[PDB]
Design a protein around this nucleic acid. Sequence first.
DNA 1: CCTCGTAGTGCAGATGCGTC
DNA 2: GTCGGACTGAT
DNA 3: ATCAGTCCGACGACGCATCTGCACTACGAGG
Lengths: 439, 245, 252, 243
Amino acid sequence: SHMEFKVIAEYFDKLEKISSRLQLTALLADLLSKSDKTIIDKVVYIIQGKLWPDFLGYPELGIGEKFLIKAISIATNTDENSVENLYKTIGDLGEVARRLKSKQQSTGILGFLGTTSKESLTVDEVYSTLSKVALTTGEGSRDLKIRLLAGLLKKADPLEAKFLVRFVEGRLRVGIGDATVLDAMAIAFGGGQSASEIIERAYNLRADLGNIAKIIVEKGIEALKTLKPQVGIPIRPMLAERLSNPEEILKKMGGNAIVDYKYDGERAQIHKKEDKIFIFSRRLENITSQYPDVVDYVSKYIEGKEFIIEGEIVAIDPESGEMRPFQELMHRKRKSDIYEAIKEYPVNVFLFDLMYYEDVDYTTKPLEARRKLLESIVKPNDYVKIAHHIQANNVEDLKSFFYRAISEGGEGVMVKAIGKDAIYQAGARGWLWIKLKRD
Amino acid sequence: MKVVYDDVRVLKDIIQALARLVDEAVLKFKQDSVELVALDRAHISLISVNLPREMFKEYDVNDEFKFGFNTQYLMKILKVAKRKEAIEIASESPDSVIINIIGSTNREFNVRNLEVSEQEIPEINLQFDISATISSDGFKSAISEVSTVTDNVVVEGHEDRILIKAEGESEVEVEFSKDTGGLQDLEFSKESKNSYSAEYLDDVLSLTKLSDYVKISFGNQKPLQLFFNMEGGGKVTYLLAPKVL
Amino acid sequence: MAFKIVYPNAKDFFSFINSITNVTDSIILNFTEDGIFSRHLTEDKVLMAIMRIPKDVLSEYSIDSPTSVKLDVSSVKKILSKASSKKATIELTETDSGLKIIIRDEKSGAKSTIYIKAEKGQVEQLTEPKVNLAVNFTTDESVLNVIAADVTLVGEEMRISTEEDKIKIEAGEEGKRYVAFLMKDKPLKELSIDTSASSSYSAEMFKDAVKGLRGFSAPTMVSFGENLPMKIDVEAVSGGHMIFWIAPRLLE
Amino acid sequence: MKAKVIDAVSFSYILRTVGDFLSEANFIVTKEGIRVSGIDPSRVVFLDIFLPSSYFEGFEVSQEKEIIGFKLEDVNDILKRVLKDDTLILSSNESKLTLTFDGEFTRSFELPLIQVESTQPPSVNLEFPFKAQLLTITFADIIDELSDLGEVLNIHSKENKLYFEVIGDLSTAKVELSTDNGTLLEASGADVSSSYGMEYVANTTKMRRASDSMELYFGSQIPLKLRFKLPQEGYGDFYIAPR
DNA sequence: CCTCGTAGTGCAGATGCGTC
DNA sequence: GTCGGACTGAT
DNA sequence: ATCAGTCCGACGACGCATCTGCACTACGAGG
Ligand SMILES: *P(=O)(O)OC[C@H]1O[C@@H](n2cnc3c(N)ncnc32)[C@H](O)[C@@H]1O
Ligand SMILES: [Mn+2]
Ligand SMILES: [Mn+2]
Ligand SMILES: [Mn+2]
Ligand SMILES: [Mn+2]
């Protein structure tokens, strides 16, 4: 409430000047340590480059590349041709709009009848105005969007009104990601360098960041070891690793390893609280509406209670069971007309992991009990199946299965890890899961 | 808090001329009349509307009532009527508002009261150098003709004629000379030449069909003001800043 | 003087310029002893249009020597689309700049003047195709619009037959087929038939020709022959003529 | 088969409104009538149309088991080309259907016969605990204005008072129908409540042409019934489902 | 029957988005 | 995803 | 004097979506 947006711009001024990850991280803690409460969530949301996490089903901002030129022309009282010609030379629009607030000003109508007043803007009203511009549906929207955006531009300072343009763009070429933010927050609020792993786990638990920050600043550094996945906010996936086919992976393992199929197409994540079907994508996005046909297949055939399961969605040949490229599946997930082309595009799902069913955590248990318990909850049919769990013994056996996998389509084959060390990590790459593919 | 007005065709042009300039507005009911003042977001416009206590069918409000709304939603609830149907607005608690459409199969709507932030604005004392009182139907045609190709109009005057023309690739000209259907009043003062953006003039093209006489006034290094007059002494104003020059 | 012509009804001149703009974005004009006369042909040689205004309807005419005015109607198309008061007075004049169109109206009492940059030249002699046609009829305007609209749902070939004093129109393919009739005095006003022949005209060209006939409240004149082009003639509201030429496809 | 209707506007309208939930239908020929019955892909709305042996005059019957299907788009596109109150004739060939107008001149459109077979009629066997009847113009006007306010249409009834209510997060709407004012007569039954969709019932308002009166039966956790009274004891029905 | 004008309604013509 | 493309380290 | 882990902004060609503005076209008030 009593804050201003000048501080964030000033602290971002000295960010494209250092090239050491051990230096900018130290400086990043100052703003968080000095900022006030009840707006800390907004401050955290600002840095990454989003107004809010993208699993709440909120619409995307509509301001684009060529509309900013018009907005700047309106704000700075310059002809469209002039600003267009100036921008055509220098690519960075921020520098294009940089000088235009020092060599020219505006008058308007407020003052001809008599009025002289100006106050520094606040972060709260900036966030509120951005949120209002976000929705702006109506019928005559464009004039209600550009003019609404131009207010802050006409109520800005020369240094401040350079990163706002990039904010509208959606990318910040400054040198700050998310892991660096976590590490800086751990040092600042926590006070101990070694106390960053608990924060990392807590972030791995919940896909959001503002809620984690607010519960960290409300209860304290503690109350993090006992957070469990509710049916809702998801958990970030893990990634694989690629290499050649030497006597390397087997020497890493030693014996037989769990071998699965490398399906092609969109992945998925399911959260069914016995009443509703929630489906997520390879990133955070509510694809439930775009995928309404299979909300019943994952409901009635999976007999049980609330769970969190992971699988993959791949298009099939309409005539009979036959894999198809993800490019073909891309055709249907765009149009509102559903029951005219949906019935011609089969959607078959597979299952490869389970996360949280019996009201207790399972992400630390070894990767055999989870598979054994998941093997129970399944109904044999032609729409829900399970992965091709097979075991080989040597390199002279992988090729026999690899050739069949190639003949059956898909990108190839994938290996896994068996034993106590095979735990389901969140994020990162690791070396537990390894993939091999062709060109 | 009881207000009754007969026709809604009058309260459609005002609303569609207010939906194109702002996102929120406030209606102020007093012991004398109803006022409405609402700036624009970019501070390049001003539209004022006043309705007296003579068109209302013998109704009165005992105190103030700050009723807020959203332009799109209110304009969407004024498209129900087709013929000359009636309307009445009333409410008791300072939280909710009840709107009713009558005559045909009755309909009622419950509307929540939003909160709108507004700033202080002084009165209007803008004098100019011209008092043209040209017709109302010709202005719409002139604008829809000239402003279809250009992004800036030019308005120059003289002791005998009013010249409206665009420049650049095409030079079209329309005049309102004293010959047959032009001016009906003019002060000499001086000759002025100014410019205005072609987009801000389209937002007030549906406000025309309320009378048959406009009052175009402007001057050198001065804004643009136009005036309309209805029965009961209604007042509508529109102040527009000039171009960068 | 050198160039001074006047036309009573601007809602006919604008119709003429729209009709000639339906085939090109540039207009070539010549002012000589025959008044107003234009000419244009599509590059594919499938549609030809000739416009002639007789030198008696015009209220005023004063020239000095043959001259041409080569125009390019690109931005004036929308500007000229604001003619009202039905028969608003319009006159044409020349300038060293190239052209100046003046419009006078009485509903509101204003003026409309434009500046157009064009060069001068010399006129060209009258050129009209020579052909003889026997089968002919005169109908209204909307009938042609209906015939053009109903044919896009079957195919792109249009054939006309008038066997045994009965006019038949068939098109499409084997699966989807169209049948129509044109009897004596049932939909028609006047008729005169000598023999029978086929047309085999194109469909898009027919649609484009029909789209440029709105605004001429007069019984249109239509004729054709055997493996020969098609001619359509309409009369102006105040005075004038406009004859098209629909090319055939021979044995295609 | 050979039929003829002196009005080609109402029939075009009824086919247009039928062909908005379906994608493929099938005509049926019997000893005394022609019927159209089908179900929606969404498995929510069920509709059936019956036409007696007087709506279309000059009815000749060639065979007693004629079953002809049609693509939904082509028939609608062809019938869209109706000039004015003309006369239409339909004759059933072996594997095609020809539509010919009778106006200023003649017309002829030919469509191939497609193969389709699907008949899953859910039995009704219902006795609704409410009954009302009102004019078609009133219903059309009163539904064509509440469409753009939400999606959850809540139907509420009381003692001889049927109320339409649509409620959103920001504001709510309400309509009132009474026997004394504007709801004719025949209001009897019990007191119940339910809720239904919006788009499904909005799409059926295109019946302001071939209609004079309509009925309305509904209950609680029970499908709602809409019945339209065509001239000469003709009727068409629309069944919707609760939420 | 002859005039608006008012409103739908269909259709090209641009700009922004998410995916590797 | 992806190939860089830096950065940062431990004998 | 060198090989192994961590992290991070660009890659532009695209189907498809959503508003904007312009021709047609049926229909209801007033002479
Ligand atoms: P490709 O590299 O295009 O896609 C990578 C994603 O595919 C999922 N994936 C591959 N192979 C498997 C198996 N056998 N089981 C489960 N998931 C698989 C990975 O999750 C990658 O995210
Ligand atoms: Mn997103
Ligand atoms: Mn955008
Ligand atoms: Mn973007
Ligand atoms: Mn892949």
